[PDB]
Design an enzyme around this catalytic site. Structure first.
Site, PDB file in Angstrom:
ATOM      1  N   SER A   1       1.099  -2.580  10.769  1.00  0.00           N
ATOM      2  CA  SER A   1       2.492  -2.605  11.197  1.00  0.00           C
ATOM      3  C   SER A   1       3.302  -3.885  10.952  1.00  0.00           C
ATOM      4  O   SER A   1       4.268  -4.185  11.666  1.00  0.00           O
ATOM      5  CB  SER A   1       2.600  -2.112  12.645  1.00  0.00           C
ATOM      6  OG  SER A   1       2.409  -0.701  12.681  1.00  0.00           O
TER       7      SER A   1
ATOM      8  N   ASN B   1       0.868  -1.174   0.000  1.00  0.00           N
ATOM      9  CA  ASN B   1       0.000   0.000   0.000  1.00  0.00           C
ATOM     10  C   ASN B   1       0.900   1.218   0.000  1.00  0.00           C
ATOM     11  O   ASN B   1       1.292   1.711   1.051  1.00  0.00           O
ATOM     12  CB  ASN B   1      -0.865  -0.006   1.251  1.00  0.00           C
ATOM     13  CG  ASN B   1      -2.021   0.965   1.171  1.00  0.00           C
ATOM     14  OD1 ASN B   1      -2.437   1.333   0.080  1.00  0.00           O
ATOM     15  ND2 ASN B   1      -2.516   1.423   2.314  1.00  0.00           N
TER      16      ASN B   1
ATOM     17  N   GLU C   1      -8.717   5.503   6.774  1.00  0.00           N
ATOM     18  CA  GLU C   1      -9.012   6.912   6.630  1.00  0.00           C
ATOM     19  C   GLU C   1     -10.294   7.224   5.905  1.00  0.00           C
ATOM     20  O   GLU C   1     -10.968   8.180   6.247  1.00  0.00           O
ATOM     21  CB  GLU C   1      -7.848   7.688   6.031  1.00  0.00           C
ATOM     22  CG  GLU C   1      -7.576   7.422   4.598  1.00  0.00           C
ATOM     23  CD  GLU C   1      -6.857   6.122   4.373  1.00  0.00           C
ATOM     24  OE1 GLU C   1      -6.354   5.508   5.340  1.00  0.00           O
ATOM     25  OE2 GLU C   1      -6.784   5.724   3.203  1.00  0.00           O
TER      26      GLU C   1
ATOM     27  N   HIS D   1     -10.585   1.486   3.249  1.00  0.00           N
ATOM     28  CA  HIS D   1      -9.380   1.671   4.053  1.00  0.00           C
ATOM     29  C   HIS D   1      -9.648   2.662   5.194  1.00  0.00           C
ATOM     30  O   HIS D   1     -10.397   3.613   5.029  1.00  0.00           O
ATOM     31  CB  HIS D   1      -8.206   2.111   3.178  1.00  0.00           C
ATOM     32  CG  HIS D   1      -6.857   1.819   3.779  1.00  0.00           C
ATOM     33  ND1 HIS D   1      -6.137   2.753   4.494  1.00  0.00           N
ATOM     34  CD2 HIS D   1      -6.113   0.684   3.794  1.00  0.00           C
ATOM     35  CE1 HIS D   1      -5.012   2.209   4.927  1.00  0.00           C
ATOM     36  NE2 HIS D   1      -4.974   0.954   4.517  1.00  0.00           N
TER      37      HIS D   1
ATOM     38  N   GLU E   1      -7.478  -4.902   9.463  1.00  0.00           N
ATOM     39  CA  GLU E   1      -6.421  -4.045   9.975  1.00  0.00           C
ATOM     40  C   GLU E   1      -6.932  -3.233  11.153  1.00  0.00           C
ATOM     41  O   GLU E   1      -7.756  -2.334  10.973  1.00  0.00           O
ATOM     42  CB  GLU E   1      -5.955  -3.045   8.922  1.00  0.00           C
ATOM     43  CG  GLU E   1      -5.881  -3.531   7.491  1.00  0.00           C
ATOM     44  CD  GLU E   1      -5.166  -2.527   6.616  1.00  0.00           C
ATOM     45  OE1 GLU E   1      -3.912  -2.561   6.586  1.00  0.00           O
ATOM     46  OE2 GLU E   1      -5.841  -1.676   6.007  1.00  0.00           O
TER      47      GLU E   1
ATOM     48  N   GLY F   1       0.292   2.091  10.790  1.00  0.00           N
ATOM     49  CA  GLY F   1       1.232   3.195  10.819  1.00  0.00           C
ATOM     50  C   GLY F   1       1.707   3.607  12.193  1.00  0.00           C
ATOM     51  O   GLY F   1       2.539   4.498  12.320  1.00  0.00           O
TER      52      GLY F   1
ATOM     53  N   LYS G   1       1.546   4.507   0.269  1.00  0.00           N
ATOM     54  CA  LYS G   1       0.905   5.720   0.749  1.00  0.00           C
ATOM     55  C   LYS G   1       1.742   6.967   0.478  1.00  0.00           C
ATOM     56  O   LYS G   1       1.215   8.075   0.507  1.00  0.00           O
ATOM     57  CB  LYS G   1       0.627   5.601   2.247  1.00  0.00           C
ATOM     58  CG  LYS G   1       0.351   4.182   2.710  1.00  0.00           C
ATOM     59  CD  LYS G   1      -1.018   4.019   3.337  1.00  0.00           C
ATOM     60  CE  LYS G   1      -0.957   4.105   4.853  1.00  0.00           C
ATOM     61  NZ  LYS G   1       0.086   3.209   5.416  1.00  0.00           N
TER      62      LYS G   1
END
Lengths: 241, 241
Positions: free
Chosen positions: A204, A10, A88, A86, A158, A164, A12
């Site tokens: 992570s 992913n 966010e 996802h 997740e 993150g 980002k």
């Protein structure tokens, strides 16, 4: 035993130059086992990877789609996988279980392979509501899918608190959530479907923790963010043996 | 005399690493006076700060909300303050006085502490229309708020020409605009409300200019962008003594 594993990246962030170096490394990497590798990104890197990534085991994906027109254009542009729901998009942009469910149904209709994301917040985890949260999310998606559609769906679990943050779930935490999701699917949709279903873990993941996570009975791969920008992503792929 | 001051940071850019260094500095900083500190940002830094910022005087805020669903999700995610009507939303994205007014009303309903931004352009300033512009903006917001709602509202006056340009307003310019806004509120809503109201100044504030600006009778704090990415933000907070 376990369905074919997926090792999804992913992307980002990152720079075009640094990224093409990664693509070179990947392209020159022999994977001696069956695994589907996915590199997900935004328009910025999507054109480059779509042209520079040559590995037989890799495929590229879009990080989100805002509407049916985008699904159509993306499809025409030659993108067949897409990441939806996802973190966010859910907490920052306010996409409801219902909205991502609709997006998942639409994408599948348009012919995409979809990685639908689910997961609870730290608050939810601590309040002991993980199981209810996760199932509500998955149930919303199921309400819109026909049994045949599940062939095009991959679920990525997740924990919002693991993404993150550097705080990974434990082999036990992941295994429990995955086992729960699979049970729900098996009893609600079918054991045939449940068995074929890939449920990946994201939050992570790195070269050092991947194998233990993968060893769990119900973990079928990973959605990786930070570590996918580094060459240790190769160790993560090897961990799905 | 003056209501409790607010020293708000508007993190418009920056890297996760550089930012966590700032958060460490803040966390270890003793503020010997009553002031509410706010760190506003986008989804990128919001998860980190929400978890890494520990100072008793700090609170975090979202930089904008696109709709009621986002307000709801953000609220659930644990964000209680929000910045609305910021310059670019008005001139670049075309949000009208009416639209931000609606956003402010919605946010308050959902239980947020709102920093509603207002301010004129260089053109307006020069044409001598500052007073009419500023009051029209504030009036639009008032039309949607019930007297009780004002308890949840903070007004940030930022001349569009002062934001990020390095061109700060003068203690006289700020004081005049703030005095005008307070008068309007006092006569239109009530003196009780007007007195409790925090009106912050934003537009190229830094460690060197803060105190003079703060010394004005009607300035109750600052919304800081550029200088909030530096450790001089600490000097800006001390300036609200």
């Amino acid at each position: 035993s376990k369905p074919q594993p997926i090792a999804a990246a992913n992307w980002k962030s990152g720079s075009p130059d640094s990224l093409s170096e990664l693509i070179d490394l990947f392209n020159s990497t022999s994977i001696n086992h069956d695994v589907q590798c996915v590199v997900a990104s935004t328009f910025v890197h999507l054109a480059m990877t779509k042209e520079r990534l040559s590995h037989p085991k890799f495929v590229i994906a879009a990080q989100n789609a805002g509407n049916a027109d985008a699904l159509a254009s993306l499809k025409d542009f030659g993108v067949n996988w897409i990441v939806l729901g996802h973190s966010e998009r859910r907490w920052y942009y306010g996409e409801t279980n219902e909205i991502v469910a609709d997006k998942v149904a639409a994408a599948v209709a348009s012919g995409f392979m979809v990685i639908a994301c689910i997961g609870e917040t730290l608050q939810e985890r601590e309040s002991g509501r993980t199981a209810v949260v996760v199932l509500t999310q998955i149930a919303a998606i199921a309400k819109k899918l026909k049994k045949a559609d599940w062939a095009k769906v991959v679920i990525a679990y997740e924990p919002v608190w693991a993404i993150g943050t550097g705080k990974v779930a434990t082999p036990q935490q992941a295994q429990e959530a995955h086992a729960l999701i699979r049970s729900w699917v098996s009893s609600k949709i079918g054991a045939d479907v449940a068995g074929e279903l890939r449920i990946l873990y994201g939050g992570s993941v790195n070269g050092k923790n991947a194998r233990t996570l993968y060893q769990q009975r119900d973990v079928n791969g990973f959605l990786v963010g930070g570590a996918s920008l580094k060459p240790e992503f190769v160790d993560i792929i090897k961990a799905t043996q």
